[PDB]
A paper describes a structure:
The bacterial flagellar motor is a huge bidirectional rotary nanomachine that drives rotation of the flagellum for bacterial motility. The cytoplasmic C ring of the flagellar motor functions as the switch complex for the rotational direction switching from counterclockwise to clockwise. The basal body is made up of the LP ring, MS ring, C ring, rod and export apparatus. Here, we present two high-resolution cryo-electron microscopy structures of the C ring-containing flagellar basal body–hook complex from Salmonella Typhimurium, which are in the default counterclockwise state and in a constitutively active CheY mutant-induced clockwise state, respectively.
Initial two-dimensional (2D) classification analyses of manually picked particles revealed that like the MS ring, the C ring adopts a 34-fold symmetric architecture. Local refinement of the C ring with C34 symmetry generated a clear density map for the C ring in the [name] state ([name]-C ring) at an overall resolution of 5.9 Å. The reconstitution revealed that the structure of the C ring consists of four subrings: the inner, upper, middle and bottom subrings. The C ring in the [name] state has a height of ~160 Å with the minimum inner diameters of ~332 Å at the inner subring, and consists of 34 protomers. Each protomer is assembled by FliG, FliM and FliN with a stoichiometry of 1:1:3. FliG in the [name]-C ring consists of the domains FliGN, FliGM, FliGCN and FliGCC and adopts a twisted “V”-shaped architecture, which is distinct from the extended apo structure of FliG from A. aeolicus. In the C ring, the upper subring is composed of FliGCC, while the middle subring is assembled by FliGCN, FliGM and FliMM. The bottom subring is formed by FliMN, FliMC and FliN. The protomer of the C ring has a “Y”-shaped architecture, and obliquely binds to the neighboring two protomers in a “S”-like manner, which generates extensive inter-protomer interactions within the C ring. The head-to-tail packing of the αtorque helices in the upper subring generates a periodic distribution of positive-to-negative charges along the [name] direction on the upper surface of the C ring.
Numbering used by the authors:
A (entry chain t), C (entry chain p), D (entry chain o), F (entry chain n), G (entry chain C2), H (entry chain C1): 51 to 137
B (entry chain s), E (entry chain m): 34 to 322
């Protein structure tokens, strides 16, 4: 509608997250330069795409001539979103 | 509930009880009673008035004109304190020091204090300063240094704004029919860092015990848990594009030289992504400091 | 539509601006504690309302029982928006 | 230094923000002429002062003979800035 | 709203309140009261008149003829200040210094001051100068140097134009039925650089704190953002050609040896265009200074 | 018309802009002699042509025997002008 | 026409000139602060109005509530323009 | 020097400008005989003094026995000149 066009003039910010993990503060203090930290996500899984910190879609990492890119694959339809938030 | 806004209006800030400040005031009252009895050769009666929290302009408008205002500094705290002596108390002290029996009631003058009266005020001020310093020492080390004496709010601006919150503790001195009064005013920002010390009642010293308590608290908190999230990169886009996200859509992003690790939106370090043990890895480089 | 409902779940940020002005850096350095700085806007004019830094409407300042509030009055329809951006 | 003097000749823009709030787009559509919108900030709190959209100090609202003014009170030293950005 | 223009007309400039100037005037009044009591052996009463802002000609027309005008310089500020002594005050001082009781009312003379009266005026002027210098020292270092004495506006032109804005602070001196008056006049341009210092009320010294405040303000502003625009070249043309701009139309331009970078119309440097990383680049050569 | 002929006698000034970019003042201070600064525009894109600071057309860079020239290609018709100003 | 409307969106600059005179550089060096310099124009003559340095009309000086104004009186039709340029 | 004396023999032209303003061509066409046009400058402000179209000083308007005159007041030192050109 016309208000969709009005908010179209408003820029927004997109965020791509590689993964997430949980650990104690003591473990973080144990970490030093060159330390290795694992993530919950596996290899080849689509990465989360966030708009102002809200996940809306998923994509795959590509490189464009010198720049990283995300190839959108799937959405976060309410059933899947509720399932992943329940975790 | 909905009201119109006026830039020339301000509200209050609940209650800020300072039991330690009241204890310091009582100790200073005892010391000043002893000092005044020593000086004037007569036994005074000092009553500690209720501690008052009010904007600076409200305190200023209640001061009789002219009045003796002395600027003091409570080192190492930053600011300028004020000691207020009413003209009646100064007149009573002058009368007592020069043999006056106090039978004749004081006459309203509204005149600048003489240099002899200035010296009387300085004699009172030194003892008051010693007493207040000794009283404050019981809870926290402080040094009081007098700066200058002024007779009007014109020579004030101890505070940036007239509406700034200040703490005023009145004191009533009685050596007979006389009921003279002196006040101590301190800006709230000066005592703001020591708010925790002044609010809760003091306990026994036990400085080593308190240090051990803090060390144990630090040790126990060290085992707490959090969530570490690393943001790969960010993209500026528009909502219309978001409505058209489909499989296979490629969005260009800037290649991040370093990966910044954030904890609940708080960056903690910058690293680089890697692949170790079949999972993504971050090679920590520098901590956010 | 359904995508309007989808973006409804996405929170946004609103910004209210009292006014704007222009000055040199030397004047800013001359400014000290307690200095007075004027604004282009006058008294009683509606304040700008910005969504993610984009002006979408105007309102008037009110106080709600202890909290400031904005009473929306007018919009920033494209003619007025272009006129005020041309300034 | 001399480069401080050079950039002094360069004018900058200052922005004063009354407050901020968050709401859904549906709530914004529900809003009409004369609607009341609340803000996160309370009454009497210092307002944010922004230079090119970056907060650098806080002040209090005053009126100068017919014009609004901001009376600077405090700064946004890194500890407080990080604390308020974490929110 | 529309009015016809007259070159012999001028307007006013709002209000320019100087609280610091009033405080300096009060301090100078106190010092001068002490000095006059010391000199004339009688207690004077000095009242600070309201500070006045008016064109120079308006101040000149109100001065009685003849009057004692003294030229002073407020170093390091550039300009020439004036100290105005009314003939009545000079006559009162002469009468007091030579045993006159003041019973006889003063007679209008309209004559040049005698050299003895000149020395009386100089004796007053030295004390006034010391007092005013001491009063100004409290807020900013200044030195006052008397230049010459004149008895007419003919010998003036302290100001470039008769309509220049000047600041006049009257003072009323009373040592009985006498109500003598002296004035201090300063051009606005002399105190223009110190306008910020004089307008807002002074605060506590805290010079190190103020320097730290300025340093923090500088540091925070250093992270601000702007827009950098580089103009490749410029062409002189006409509007008729602009109405005929079509695809393929070639317009000759002069080859720029250097590319000047402008920020909101403010040149900051000169550079040369280049191609780096697949995008246009500017090799910075010299900054605009 | 005749007033078009009258204003024809009035010369005007034309400005050709290679490109534009945005950066912080701190980044500008970091820049030294020989530093490289990128631009938003890409390679081969038509350059903006401005009359007294107002964009009216676009062209391509050519060299005339020793002098640079602009070969006009397209116009800034209101739809495109509004689209590029919205950016 | 439509191109008149297009150039209407382009702002222009207007210049009002009180008068003109000719003198040697030595006379200018002789001039000091407060010096008096005469002009060729007389009292009450209409002042020249220039668009980008080109004279197009004449007017009379008026004051609007605090601001100077020019009340247009005559034009610079080609015969008069040629006559005054021949001078 | 001697070349200053040489150029002293060369006469120059001085220009005094009452004020400046900006408007559209359509507004100019709307203007008729007796129309009122405002200027950016206010009442009592010093007028610009231009040598061959270059501003070098400011003065105040006076009348000499039948002829207008300019009473020089201030200069256009580079800081002020850059500030007023930035406008």
């Amino acid at each position: 509608m016309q208000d969709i066009d009005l908010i179209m003039d408003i820029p927004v910010k997109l965020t791509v997250e590689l993964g997430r993990t949980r650990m104690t503060i003591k473990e973080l203090l144990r970490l030093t330069q060159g330390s290795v930290v694992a993530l919950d996500g596996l290899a080849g899984e689509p990465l989360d795409i966030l708009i102002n910190g809200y996940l809306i879609a998923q994509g795959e990492v590509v490189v464009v001539a010198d720049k990283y890119g995300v190839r959108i694959t799937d959405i976060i339809t309410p059933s899947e979103r509720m399932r992943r938030l329940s975790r | 509930d909905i009201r119109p806004y006026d830039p020339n209006t301000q509200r209050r800030v609940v209650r800020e009880r300072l039991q330690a400040l009241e204890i310091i005031n009582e100790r200073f009252a005892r010391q000043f009673r002893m000092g005044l009895f020593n000086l004037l050769r007569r036994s005074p009666d000092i009553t500690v008035g209720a501690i008052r929290i009010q904007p600076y302009h409200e305190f200023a408008r209640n001061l009789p004109v002219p009045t003796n205002l002395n600027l003091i500094h409570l080192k190492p705290l930053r600011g300028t304190g004020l000691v207020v002596f009413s003209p009646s108390l100064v007149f009573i002290a002058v009368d007592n020091l020069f043999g006056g029996d106090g039978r004749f009631p004081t006459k309203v003058e509204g005149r600048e204090f003489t240099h002899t009266e200035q010296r009387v005020i300085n004699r009172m001020l030194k003892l008051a300063l010693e007493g207040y310093s000794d009283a404050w020492k019981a809870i926290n080390p402080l040094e009081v240094e007098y700066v200058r004496s002024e007779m009007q709010v014109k020579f004030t601006n101890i505070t940036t704004s007239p509406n700034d919150i200040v703490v005023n503790t009145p004191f009533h001195v009685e050596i007979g029919n006389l009921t003279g009064e002196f006040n101590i005013c301190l800006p709230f920002s000066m005592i703001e860092p020591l708010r925790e010390l002044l609010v809760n009642p003091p306990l026994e010293n036990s400085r080593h015990e308190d240090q051990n308590w803090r060390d144990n608290l630090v040790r126990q908190v060290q085992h707490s848990e959090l969530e570490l999230v690393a943001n790969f990169a960010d993209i500026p886009l528009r909502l219309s594009q978001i409505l058209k996200l489909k499989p296979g859509d490629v969005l260009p992003i800037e290649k991040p030289d370093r990966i910044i690790a954030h904890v609940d939106g708080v960056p903690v370090l910058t690293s680089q992504y890697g692949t170790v043990n079949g999972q993504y890895a971050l090679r920590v480089e520098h901590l956010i400091n």
